[PDB]
Design a protein around this ligand. Structure first.
Ligand SMILES: *[C@@H]1O[C@H](CO)[C@@H](O)[C@H](O)[C@H]1NC(C)=O
Ligand SMILES: *[C@@H]1O[C@H](CO)[C@@H](O)[C@H](O)[C@H]1NC(C)=O
Ligand SMILES: *[C@@H]1O[C@H](CO)[C@@H](O)[C@H](O)[C@H]1NC(C)=O
Lengths: 321, 158, 158, 321, 158, 321
């Protein structure tokens, strides 16, 4: 008559690592690392992302004629932009403090576009002629839709004194521009006046832009450059414009109605007609695991990213062969 | 095994004990079989479950990467930003992998300890009345019958 | 307890032993009482004291936050600075909390081990001359008198 | 006759956490986290902080007329500033590289103010008239005390050629300014000359400031703006000023005699008439614990900050019920 | 030692056993000497070797400092860069020093455990046939001759 | 007859630390921290570093006449520069975006210098006279070797319209400069024209530099300042220069043929005629240890830097006395 003490064995083939021993076979284990994603871009918690496609953030905000898909966009969860969007800055130039603006966009979920200065309001200057073959729309020469490229009228460009006050209760993103011609004759042709300036002011901003006339490489068939600036106009503050030429003027601005939780992710993927609670630039995660190894940049209710290929905890004991 | 029971003096586990993690095999004139020790098994289930939960939650406050962009003349701070994000990810990967490694070793030892203590509980009762075979088993001097077998598992014998 | 003594085969501790962490209860015709084992108690005091000191000093070289300010157009580096300061604080909080958790488990086990080794020291001497009850106690076969009791604690018996 | 092995129990109710078990009652424990502070702002190691109160760093350095409390301050341990000080930049404007200056202040414990250019030394320009209703002192129009707002004298503003050499053995903080008027008539009224500049130079600095005339929102009743600049003049270097208008000139500068260990903390708290070895923006710590959870930003001999609510080490054994 | 064998019930090690980490001393009419237990010694060599390798490689993905320069008016980001590089170096120094401390404690315990299990393997076989002296030694009741001594080490006795 | 269980002791004196006990003597241990270096600067994997000695990066790229040692340098592994090189910027001034350039150098192992604009090609301006006593070479007045200091010819400085296109398949580093005189008479003497500009343009750059005339401290006997700029000219892009004075013009530019793994280390050490696989600014490491405590900044196959004085693992057991 015998009584024996013993322990459970099973048909398990699950393995765990320890400091002293690798690949120990255990009766039970719990994998805690999520390795699968769905490879799509999805709605986040019901809310569709803003998928720019071929447009850049600059191309979207300024109103590149090829970016009409985004004339008025709904509330978004996150924004997706390609590494190298073709539709950006159709008339070549620079976008001043662009990355600081992009940063500010990561804390915004909704814009509402409002007209601050009507195209039909310019009396001493021409407003329908500021178009370019660099910015085509349907085969014809066009231009950024949210700003106005103003020219001289009847051989004169009187000094512009303009003013907007933010009636709205929301912060307002205001964009404007300056044209840097390639020669003195172009300056004459376009604006009449040889030496120009643009002065912009709010309660915080103290700005004067002077055009730079220089000869440069043709980008999209243009030797001119456009340089774009922005500011956030607080509530009940006013923005004062004064210019005598080279002025790319605001027609539209954006009211900010911002959820405040968002990101611009870089991805070549298109919309995947799916819903998820956790999105990466490579695909969405639906997991109950505490960790994942898909990609560092996620948004939503997400597992902790680690760089491991494998994370498995022992729960049971050393399985016997 | 630090405690010498699992794959030590008890050479291997039992496919026939499906009932729990640790238990007994008895053999006599009336027959033979397995019975799990529910108490130490449950003590083991709780310990391991809390451990997992502890592991999961201590790692719940971790570094989150945040998309951040820089122009062609901000290479230094871009690189700063790259080496910072990677630094933390490396720190946390290491933390995760090490905890798992260390705690896997502790879990295997924990089971080994539970088996040894269960062995000792039975040994301390049987005393003189059984030959300790040196394989996890006690051969009885006197006949033991199913109720006598309950008695050992019960903790009330003699 | 990994070692099976504390709240294992010895069901509970002694309110009546105020003298040290581990010791003996004796009972005979002359009476009964407690005596602490000063040597293993002191070995335990030193181990635990060094541990605390080690814990304290390994954490003495930690991250110090430094006030740092940025204008309205330096949001990216401000945020960089925020996520960096928080990253390290999280890393060190985690380190602190985990060390304490792991080392608390080791301290409880350490005490358990000291109790078991003290039990074994007494068992290895008594040998045949005492019935091992299975509760931390040895019932003597032959009468043992206070000087006989010193003898066991002394480590010189028979 | 029995001999038993056993272990200590007591009446302890102290609890510790482990990975496998929470709230284990132990006979002894050592709490290692300090959770208490005194809620005051105190002297550090005997040495009083500079508590700006309602003044900002800019308001203090420039000499805002409402910041007379800080005309000459003693050695300080740390500096305390409110989130939104009312007394800053009374005549509206910007403070160039302000945050870099604030950073430099964190490594300074003492300033000594010296006159570099006497108010009584301007011969061809008026010096007693540069005052403003934006910067009141005792009901009357006044101005920043450390700089001088110079106007034309007898319908003339001759070109200023000035020079200071740092005799002192200490680095010297020098502040100056420029006035940006709101219109051409104000430029005429104040300085006579229509187009102006200020050139500043040392061995390291190569500067020319051109005033920006623009119409903007009234801040404190002013549409003008002041723009302030600073530099550190090394020993035996000289600072050359040349201007023909819009010049806010240095009267005083600060000698740096810097301990080098300090910080600017943000707090709404007032002085607490106490002494301490460890100060946080929320209150002071007097503890022998290695860790604390009061606030990340401390100064002095301080415990390590952790974000824990609880850190308790087991010392004794598992206490029996 | 948590397991009570090394510098516990076995007071000290053997200068005379050069052959391996753990083994036996025998003494009889034919003479006396040492014999290492190659199996548990090798099990110990593998464990310790893997440990070192594990320690080495978990630390192979660490923070690398990258020279980075700033002008006289970039003090804030220079200081940011200084406090970031130092932060990680401190984190990794701490990780390195702590792992070594914790794993040194585990290695000493591991050896202690191997000695105790080897002691128990010999005890479980000798049984009644030997007086357990309480110092690591078993005095035989009956004469044991070199082949009888092989038998114990062999694991096949009686 | 006795059989005993026991364990190995030896004559070892090696010690390890544990949490509960310091200086435990063990039979065997493995030291894992490298504490020794050779104190020299060595070739890395056969490839000699560029040891600037007394020259700075600026002094080397611009062609400081005292830096002839580096007129044409071979492929390099790393670059070594002194804390305070004497030979930098011999004619005093600033180097625009210098640190961003230095950063870009850390990802470059080879330059090839090519002539983009020949000295012998200036027709309406003098090219052999732009020399200075600040930049001596062999006792005589000289100047930066890679750029050309152009003056008026026969009392005239016609407008410069120049252009270079990058034929090469490699990115090209192009350096140019501007002279800021100390007075109007110097402007007259040197360039004739009173008000000047330099316009520089590629497909990405839109630049116009205006000289700043101001009185300043003599540095190396000069009150003038030189201000240097750079750009990376992409393949098949062109660089357009237009100036009417104050132009320090490119004679040479650098083709980039970049390994991409390098660093600028700061060290006062000279070349050590040695080879190594791991270099620090203090000396080279030849070790099989996983960690070292020499210096944070290393290059090559290197151990992990830790700030420890000691890292020793136990392998054997507790040695008995
Ligand atoms: C902006 O317009 C609002 C609406 O009348 C006005 O109350 C506010 O004072 C204005 N702010 C200015 C003029 O700066
Ligand atoms: C500044 O003044 C001192 C005192 O004479 C003089 O030695 C030094 O050369 C001066 N530095 C200049 C003129 O830049
Ligand atoms: C640069 O020169 C090359 C060689 O002819 C030419 O193909 C390219 O178009 C030029 N780029 C310009 C003119 O911007």
């Amino acid at each position: 008559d015998q009584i024996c003490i013993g322990y459970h064995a099973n048909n398990s083939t699950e393995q765990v690592d320890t400091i002293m021993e690798k690949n120990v076979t255990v009766t039970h284990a719990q994998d805690i690392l999520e390795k699968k994603h769905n490879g799509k871009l999805c709605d986040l918690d019901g809310v569709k992302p803003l998928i720019l496609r071929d447009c850049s953030v600059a191309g979207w905000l300024l109103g590149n004629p090829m970016c009409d898909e985004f004339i008025n966009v709904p509330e978004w969860s996150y924004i997706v932009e390609k590494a190298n969007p073709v539709n950006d800055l159709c008339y070549p130039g620079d976008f001043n403090d662009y990355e600081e603006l992009k940063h500010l966009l990561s804390r915004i979920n909704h814009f509402e576009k409002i007209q601050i200065i009507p195209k039909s309001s310019w009396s001493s200057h021409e407003a329908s002629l500021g178009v370019s073959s660099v910015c085509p729309y349907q085969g014809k020469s066009s231009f950024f839709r949210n700003v106005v490229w103003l020219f001289k009228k009847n051989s004169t460009y009187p000094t512009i004194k303009r003013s907007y006050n933010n009636t709205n209760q929301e912060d307002l993103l205001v964009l404007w521009g300056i044209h840097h011609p390639n020669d003195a004759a172009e300056q004459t042709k376009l604006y009449q006046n040889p030496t120009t300036y643009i002065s912009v002011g709010t309660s915080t901003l103290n700005q004067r832009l002077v055009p730079r006339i220089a000869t440069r490489s043709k980008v999209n068939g243009q030797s001119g450059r456009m340089e774009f600036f922005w500011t956030i106009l607080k509530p009940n503050d006013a923005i004062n414009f004064e210019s005598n030429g080279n002025f790319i003027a605001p027609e539209y601005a954006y009211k900010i109605v911002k959820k405040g939780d968002s990101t611009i992710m870089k991805s070549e993927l298109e919309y995947g007609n799916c819903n998820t609670k956790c999105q990466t630039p490579m695909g969405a995660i639906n997991s109950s695991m505490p960790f994942h190894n898909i990609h560092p940049l996620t948004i939503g209710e997400c597992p902790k990213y680690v760089k491991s290929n494998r994370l498995v905890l022992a729960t049971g004991l050393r399985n016997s062969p | 095994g630090l405690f010498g029971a699992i794959a030590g003096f008890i050479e291997g586990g039992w496919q026939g004990m499906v009932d729990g993690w640790y238990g007994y095999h008895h053999s006599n004139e009336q027959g033979s079989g397995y019975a799990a020790d529910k108490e130490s098994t449950q003590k083991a289930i709780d310990g391991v479950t809390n451990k997992v939960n502890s592991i999961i939650d201590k790692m719940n406050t971790q570094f989150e990467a945040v998309g951040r962009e820089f122009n062609n003349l901000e290479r230094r701070i871009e690189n700063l930003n790259k080496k910072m994000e990677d630094g933390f990810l490396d720190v946390w990967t290491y933390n995760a992998e090490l905890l798992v490694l260390m705690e896997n070793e502790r879990t295997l030892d924990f089971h080994d300890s539970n088996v040894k203590n269960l062995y000792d509980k039975v040994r301390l009762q049987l005393r003189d009345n059984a030959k300790e075979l040196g394989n996890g088993c006690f051969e009885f001097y006197h006949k033991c019958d199913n109720e006598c077998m309950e008695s050992v598992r019960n903790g009330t014998y003699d």
